[PDB]
JSON list of C-alpha atoms and ligand atoms in Angstrom, two decimals:
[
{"chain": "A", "resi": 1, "resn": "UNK", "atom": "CA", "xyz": [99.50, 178.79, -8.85]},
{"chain": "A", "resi": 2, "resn": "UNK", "atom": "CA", "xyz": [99.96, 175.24, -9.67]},
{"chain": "A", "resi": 3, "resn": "UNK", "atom": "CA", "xyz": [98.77, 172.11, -8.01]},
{"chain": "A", "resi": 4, "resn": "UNK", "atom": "CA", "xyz": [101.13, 169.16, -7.34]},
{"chain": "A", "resi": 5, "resn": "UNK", "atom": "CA", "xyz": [98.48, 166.30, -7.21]},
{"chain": "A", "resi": 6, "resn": "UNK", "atom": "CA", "xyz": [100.19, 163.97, -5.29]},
{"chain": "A", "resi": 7, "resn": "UNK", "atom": "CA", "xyz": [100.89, 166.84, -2.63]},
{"chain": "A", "resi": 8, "resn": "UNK", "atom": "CA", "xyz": [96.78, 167.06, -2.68]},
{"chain": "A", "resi": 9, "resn": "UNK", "atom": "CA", "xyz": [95.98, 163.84, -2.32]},
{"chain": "A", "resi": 10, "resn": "UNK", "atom": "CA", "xyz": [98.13, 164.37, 1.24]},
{"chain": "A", "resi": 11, "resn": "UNK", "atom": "CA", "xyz": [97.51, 166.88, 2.63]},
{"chain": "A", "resi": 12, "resn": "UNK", "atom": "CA", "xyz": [93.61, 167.84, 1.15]},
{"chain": "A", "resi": 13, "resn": "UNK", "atom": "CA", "xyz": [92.18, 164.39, 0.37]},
{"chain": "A", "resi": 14, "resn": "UNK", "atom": "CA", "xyz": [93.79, 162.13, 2.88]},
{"chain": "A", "resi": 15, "resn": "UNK", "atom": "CA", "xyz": [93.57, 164.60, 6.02]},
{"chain": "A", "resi": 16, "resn": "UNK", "atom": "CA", "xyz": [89.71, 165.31, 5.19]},
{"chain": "A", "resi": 17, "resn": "UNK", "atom": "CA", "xyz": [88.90, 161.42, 4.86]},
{"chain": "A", "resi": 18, "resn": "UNK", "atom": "CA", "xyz": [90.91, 160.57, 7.86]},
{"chain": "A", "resi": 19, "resn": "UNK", "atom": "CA", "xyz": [89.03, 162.89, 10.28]},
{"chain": "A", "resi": 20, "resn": "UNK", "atom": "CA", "xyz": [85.76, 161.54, 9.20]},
{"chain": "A", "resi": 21, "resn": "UNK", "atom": "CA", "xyz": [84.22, 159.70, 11.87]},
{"chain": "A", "resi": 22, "resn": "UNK", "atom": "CA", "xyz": [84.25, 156.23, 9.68]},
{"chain": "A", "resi": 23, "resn": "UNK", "atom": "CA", "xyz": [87.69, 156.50, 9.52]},
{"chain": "A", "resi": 24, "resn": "UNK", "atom": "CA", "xyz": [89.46, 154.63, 12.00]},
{"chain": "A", "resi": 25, "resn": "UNK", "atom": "CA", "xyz": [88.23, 150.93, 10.51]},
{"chain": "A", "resi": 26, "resn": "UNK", "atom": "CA", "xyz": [90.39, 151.87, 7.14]},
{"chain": "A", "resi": 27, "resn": "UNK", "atom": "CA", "xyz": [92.94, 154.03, 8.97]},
{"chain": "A", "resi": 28, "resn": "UNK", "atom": "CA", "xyz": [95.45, 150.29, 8.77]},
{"chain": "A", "resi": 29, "resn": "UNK", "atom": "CA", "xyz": [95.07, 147.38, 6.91]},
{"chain": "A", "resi": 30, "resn": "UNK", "atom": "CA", "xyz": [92.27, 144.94, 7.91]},
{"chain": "A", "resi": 31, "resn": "UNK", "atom": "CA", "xyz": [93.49, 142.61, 10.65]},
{"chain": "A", "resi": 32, "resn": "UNK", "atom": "CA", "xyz": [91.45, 139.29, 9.63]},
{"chain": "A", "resi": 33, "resn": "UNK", "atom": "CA", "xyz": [93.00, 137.15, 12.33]},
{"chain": "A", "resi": 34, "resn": "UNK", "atom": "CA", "xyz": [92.15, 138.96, 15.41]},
{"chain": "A", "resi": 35, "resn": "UNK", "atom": "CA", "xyz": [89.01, 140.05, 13.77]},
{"chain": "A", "resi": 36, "resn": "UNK", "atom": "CA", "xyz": [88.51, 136.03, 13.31]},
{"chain": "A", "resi": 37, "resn": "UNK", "atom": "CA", "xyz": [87.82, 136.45, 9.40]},
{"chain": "A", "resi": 38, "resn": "UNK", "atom": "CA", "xyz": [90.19, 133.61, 8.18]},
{"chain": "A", "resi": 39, "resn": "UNK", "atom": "CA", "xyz": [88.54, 133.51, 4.56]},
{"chain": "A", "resi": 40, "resn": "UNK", "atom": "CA", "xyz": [89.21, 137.66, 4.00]},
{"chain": "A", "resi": 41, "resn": "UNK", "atom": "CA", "xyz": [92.61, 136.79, 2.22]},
{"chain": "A", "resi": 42, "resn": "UNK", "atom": "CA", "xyz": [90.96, 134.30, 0.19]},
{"chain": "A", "resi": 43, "resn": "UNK", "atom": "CA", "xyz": [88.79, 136.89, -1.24]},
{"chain": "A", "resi": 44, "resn": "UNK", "atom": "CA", "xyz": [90.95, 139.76, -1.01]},
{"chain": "A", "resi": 45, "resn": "UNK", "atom": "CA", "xyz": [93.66, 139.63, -3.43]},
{"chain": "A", "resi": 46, "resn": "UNK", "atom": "CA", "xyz": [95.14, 142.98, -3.19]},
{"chain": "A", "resi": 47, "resn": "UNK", "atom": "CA", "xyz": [94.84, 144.43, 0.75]},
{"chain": "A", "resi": 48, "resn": "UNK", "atom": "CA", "xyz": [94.92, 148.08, 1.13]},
{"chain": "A", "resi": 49, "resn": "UNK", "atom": "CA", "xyz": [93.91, 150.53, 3.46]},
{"chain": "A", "resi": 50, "resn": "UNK", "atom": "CA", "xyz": [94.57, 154.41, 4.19]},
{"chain": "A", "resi": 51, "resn": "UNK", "atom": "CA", "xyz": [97.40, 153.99, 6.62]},
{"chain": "A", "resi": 52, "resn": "UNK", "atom": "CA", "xyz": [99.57, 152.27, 3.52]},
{"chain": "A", "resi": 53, "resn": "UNK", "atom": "CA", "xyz": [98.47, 155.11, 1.14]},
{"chain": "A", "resi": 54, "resn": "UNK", "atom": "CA", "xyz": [99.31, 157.73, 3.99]},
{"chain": "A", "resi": 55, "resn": "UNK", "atom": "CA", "xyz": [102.68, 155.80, 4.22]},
{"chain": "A", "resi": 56, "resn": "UNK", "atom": "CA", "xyz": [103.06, 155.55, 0.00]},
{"chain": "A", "resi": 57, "resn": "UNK", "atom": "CA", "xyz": [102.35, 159.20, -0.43]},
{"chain": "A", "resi": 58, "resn": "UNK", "atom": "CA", "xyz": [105.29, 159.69, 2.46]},
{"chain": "A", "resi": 59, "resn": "UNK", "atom": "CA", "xyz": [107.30, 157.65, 0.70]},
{"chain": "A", "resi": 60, "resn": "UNK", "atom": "CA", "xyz": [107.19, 158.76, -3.02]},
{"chain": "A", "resi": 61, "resn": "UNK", "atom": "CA", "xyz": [105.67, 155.35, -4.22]},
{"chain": "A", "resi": 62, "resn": "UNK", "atom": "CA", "xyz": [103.26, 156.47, -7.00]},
{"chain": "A", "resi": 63, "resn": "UNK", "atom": "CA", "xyz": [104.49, 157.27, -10.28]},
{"chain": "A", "resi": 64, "resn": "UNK", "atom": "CA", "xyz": [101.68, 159.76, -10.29]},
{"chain": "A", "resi": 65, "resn": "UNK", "atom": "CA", "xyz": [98.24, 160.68, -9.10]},
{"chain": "A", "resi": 66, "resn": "UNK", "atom": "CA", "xyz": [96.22, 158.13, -10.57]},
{"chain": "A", "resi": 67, "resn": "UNK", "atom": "CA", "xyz": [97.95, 155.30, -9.14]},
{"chain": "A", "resi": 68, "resn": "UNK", "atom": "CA", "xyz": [97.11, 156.98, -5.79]},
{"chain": "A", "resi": 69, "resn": "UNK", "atom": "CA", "xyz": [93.75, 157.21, -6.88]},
{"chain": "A", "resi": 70, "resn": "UNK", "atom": "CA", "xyz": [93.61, 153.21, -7.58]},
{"chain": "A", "resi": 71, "resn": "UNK", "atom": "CA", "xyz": [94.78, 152.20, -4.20]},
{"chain": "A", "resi": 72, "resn": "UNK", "atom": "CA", "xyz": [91.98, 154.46, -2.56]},
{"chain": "A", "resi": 73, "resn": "UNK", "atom": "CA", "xyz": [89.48, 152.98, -5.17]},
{"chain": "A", "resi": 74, "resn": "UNK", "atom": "CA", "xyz": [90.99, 149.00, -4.58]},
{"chain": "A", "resi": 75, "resn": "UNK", "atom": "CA", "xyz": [90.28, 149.98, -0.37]},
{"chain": "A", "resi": 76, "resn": "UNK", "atom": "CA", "xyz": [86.68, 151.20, -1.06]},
{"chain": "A", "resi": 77, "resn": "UNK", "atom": "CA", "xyz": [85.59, 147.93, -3.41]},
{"chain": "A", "resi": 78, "resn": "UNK", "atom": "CA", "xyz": [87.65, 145.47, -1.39]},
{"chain": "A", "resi": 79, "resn": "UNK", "atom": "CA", "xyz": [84.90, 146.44, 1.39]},
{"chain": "A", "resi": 80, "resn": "UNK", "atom": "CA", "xyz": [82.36, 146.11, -0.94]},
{"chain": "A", "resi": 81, "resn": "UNK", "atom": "CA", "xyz": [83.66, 142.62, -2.14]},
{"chain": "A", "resi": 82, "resn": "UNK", "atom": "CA", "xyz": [84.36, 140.68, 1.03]},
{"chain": "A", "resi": 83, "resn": "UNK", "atom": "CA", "xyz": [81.21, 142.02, 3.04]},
{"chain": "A", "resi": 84, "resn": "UNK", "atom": "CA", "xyz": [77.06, 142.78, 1.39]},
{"chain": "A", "resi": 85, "resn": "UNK", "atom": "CA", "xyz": [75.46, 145.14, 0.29]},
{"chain": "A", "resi": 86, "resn": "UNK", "atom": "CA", "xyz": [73.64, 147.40, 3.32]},
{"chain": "A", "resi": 87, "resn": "UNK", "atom": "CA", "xyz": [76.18, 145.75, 5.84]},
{"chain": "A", "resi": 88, "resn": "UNK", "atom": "CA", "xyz": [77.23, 149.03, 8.48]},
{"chain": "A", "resi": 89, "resn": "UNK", "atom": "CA", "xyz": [81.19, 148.70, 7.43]},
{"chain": "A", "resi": 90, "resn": "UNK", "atom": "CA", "xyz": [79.67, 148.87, 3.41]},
{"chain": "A", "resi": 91, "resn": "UNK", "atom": "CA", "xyz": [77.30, 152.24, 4.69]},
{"chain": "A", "resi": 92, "resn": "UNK", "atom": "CA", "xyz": [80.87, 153.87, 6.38]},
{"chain": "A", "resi": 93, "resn": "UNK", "atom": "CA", "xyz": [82.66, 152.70, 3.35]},
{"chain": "A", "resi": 94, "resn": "UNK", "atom": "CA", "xyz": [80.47, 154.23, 0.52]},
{"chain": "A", "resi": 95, "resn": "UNK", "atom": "CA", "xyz": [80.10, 157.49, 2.54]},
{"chain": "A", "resi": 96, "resn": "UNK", "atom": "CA", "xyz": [83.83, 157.73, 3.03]},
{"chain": "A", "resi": 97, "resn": "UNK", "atom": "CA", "xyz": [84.12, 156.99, -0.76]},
{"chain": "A", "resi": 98, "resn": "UNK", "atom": "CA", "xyz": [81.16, 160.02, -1.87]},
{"chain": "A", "resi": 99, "resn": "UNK", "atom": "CA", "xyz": [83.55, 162.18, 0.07]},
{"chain": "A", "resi": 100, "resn": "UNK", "atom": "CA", "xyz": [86.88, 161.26, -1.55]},
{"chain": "A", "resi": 101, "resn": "UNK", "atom": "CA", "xyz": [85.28, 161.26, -4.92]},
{"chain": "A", "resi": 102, "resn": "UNK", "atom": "CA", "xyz": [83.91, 165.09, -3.81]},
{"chain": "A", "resi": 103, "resn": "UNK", "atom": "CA", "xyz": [87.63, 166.16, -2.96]},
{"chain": "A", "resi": 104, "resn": "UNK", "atom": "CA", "xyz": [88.78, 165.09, -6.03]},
{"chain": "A", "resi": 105, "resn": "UNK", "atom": "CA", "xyz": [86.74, 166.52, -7.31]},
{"chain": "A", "resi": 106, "resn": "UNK", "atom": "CA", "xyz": [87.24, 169.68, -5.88]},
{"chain": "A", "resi": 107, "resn": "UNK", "atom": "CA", "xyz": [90.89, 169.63, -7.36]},
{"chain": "A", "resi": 108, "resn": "UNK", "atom": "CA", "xyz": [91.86, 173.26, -7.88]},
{"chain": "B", "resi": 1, "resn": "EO4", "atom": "C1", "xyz": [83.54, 144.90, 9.77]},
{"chain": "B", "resi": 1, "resn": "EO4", "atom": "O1", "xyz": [84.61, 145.36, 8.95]},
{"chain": "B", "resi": 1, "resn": "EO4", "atom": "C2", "xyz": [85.76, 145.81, 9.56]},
{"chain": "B", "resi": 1, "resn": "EO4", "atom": "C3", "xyz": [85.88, 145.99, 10.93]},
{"chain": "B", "resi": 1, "resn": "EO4", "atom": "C4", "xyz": [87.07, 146.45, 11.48]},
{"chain": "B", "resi": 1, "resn": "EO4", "atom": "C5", "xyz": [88.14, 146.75, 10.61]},
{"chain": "B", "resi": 1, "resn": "EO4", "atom": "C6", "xyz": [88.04, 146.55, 9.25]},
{"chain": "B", "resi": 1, "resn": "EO4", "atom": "C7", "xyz": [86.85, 146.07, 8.69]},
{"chain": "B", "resi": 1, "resn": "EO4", "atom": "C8", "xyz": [86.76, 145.82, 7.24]},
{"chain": "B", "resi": 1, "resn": "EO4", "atom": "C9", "xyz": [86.42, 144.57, 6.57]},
{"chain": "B", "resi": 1, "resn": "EO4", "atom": "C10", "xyz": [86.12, 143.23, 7.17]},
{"chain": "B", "resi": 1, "resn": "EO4", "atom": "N1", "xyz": [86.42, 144.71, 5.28]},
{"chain": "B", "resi": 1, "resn": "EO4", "atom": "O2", "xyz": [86.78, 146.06, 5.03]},
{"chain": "B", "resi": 1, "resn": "EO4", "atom": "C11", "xyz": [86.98, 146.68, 6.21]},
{"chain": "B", "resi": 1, "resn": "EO4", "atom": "C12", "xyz": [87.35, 148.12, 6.14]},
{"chain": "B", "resi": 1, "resn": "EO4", "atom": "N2", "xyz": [89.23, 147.17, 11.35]},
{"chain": "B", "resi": 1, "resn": "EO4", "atom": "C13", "xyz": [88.92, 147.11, 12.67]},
{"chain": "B", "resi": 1, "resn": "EO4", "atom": "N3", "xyz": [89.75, 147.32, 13.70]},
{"chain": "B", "resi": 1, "resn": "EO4", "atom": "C14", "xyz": [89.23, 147.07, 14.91]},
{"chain": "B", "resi": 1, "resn": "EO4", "atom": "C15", "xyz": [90.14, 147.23, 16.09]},
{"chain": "B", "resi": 1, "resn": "EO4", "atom": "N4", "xyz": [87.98, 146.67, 15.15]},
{"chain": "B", "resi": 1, "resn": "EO4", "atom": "C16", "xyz": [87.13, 146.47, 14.13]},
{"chain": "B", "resi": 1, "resn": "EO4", "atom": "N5", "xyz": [85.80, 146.25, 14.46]},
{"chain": "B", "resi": 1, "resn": "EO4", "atom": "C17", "xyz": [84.65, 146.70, 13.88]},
{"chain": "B", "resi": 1, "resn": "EO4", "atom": "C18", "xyz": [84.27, 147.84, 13.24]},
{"chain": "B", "resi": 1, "resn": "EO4", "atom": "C19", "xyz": [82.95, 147.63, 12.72]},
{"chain": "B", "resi": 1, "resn": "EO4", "atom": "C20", "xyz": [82.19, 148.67, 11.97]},
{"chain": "B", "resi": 1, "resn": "EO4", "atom": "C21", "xyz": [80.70, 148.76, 12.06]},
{"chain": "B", "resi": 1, "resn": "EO4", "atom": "C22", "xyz": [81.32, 148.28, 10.81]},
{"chain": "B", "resi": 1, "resn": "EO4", "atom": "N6", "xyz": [82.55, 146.40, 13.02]},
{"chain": "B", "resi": 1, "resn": "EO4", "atom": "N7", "xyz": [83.57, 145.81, 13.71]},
{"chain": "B", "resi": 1, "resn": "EO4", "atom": "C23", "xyz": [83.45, 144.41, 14.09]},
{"chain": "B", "resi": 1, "resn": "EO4", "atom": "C24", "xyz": [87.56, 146.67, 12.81]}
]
């Protein structure tokens, strides 16, 4: 059978990565004002998170797959940007990432 990749990246690659017990800190965009970061949107150019991707898959947003892809890759190295290397939300972030690069790679 064939595999509609935007499908997929729904209901294989999203659902596994938002069970994962890092989850819930990239399950909605980062709220920098009650977290009392005022410089993240300074930094951050382009926000994103996995409740807007959940929410762009739902709505038929990407042109494709890869564009998908992007968004999940811009939420993984925002992380990286605005905080340091070895920092706890960096460890949740990179192990959330191994696992969404292993899904798609696991793309039947
Ligand atoms: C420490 O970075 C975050 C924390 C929370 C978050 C997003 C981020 C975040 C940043 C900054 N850059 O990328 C992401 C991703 N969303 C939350 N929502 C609530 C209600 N509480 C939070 N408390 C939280 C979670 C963590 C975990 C150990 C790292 N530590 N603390 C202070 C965060």
């Amino acid at each position: 059978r064939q595999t509609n990749q935007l499908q997929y990246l729904l209901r294989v690659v999203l659902k596994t990565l938002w069970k994962h017990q890092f989850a819930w800190p990239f399950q909605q965009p980062v709220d920098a004002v009650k977290l009392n970061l005022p410089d993240y949107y300074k930094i951050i150019k382009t926000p994103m998170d996995m409740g807007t991707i959940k929410k762009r898959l739902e709505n038929n947003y990407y042109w494709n797959a890869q564009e998908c892809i992007q968004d999940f890759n811009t939420m993984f190295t925002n992380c990286y940007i605005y905080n340091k290397p070895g920092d706890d939300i960096v460890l949740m972030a990179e192990a959330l990432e191994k696992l969404f690069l292993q899904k798609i790679n696991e793309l039947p």
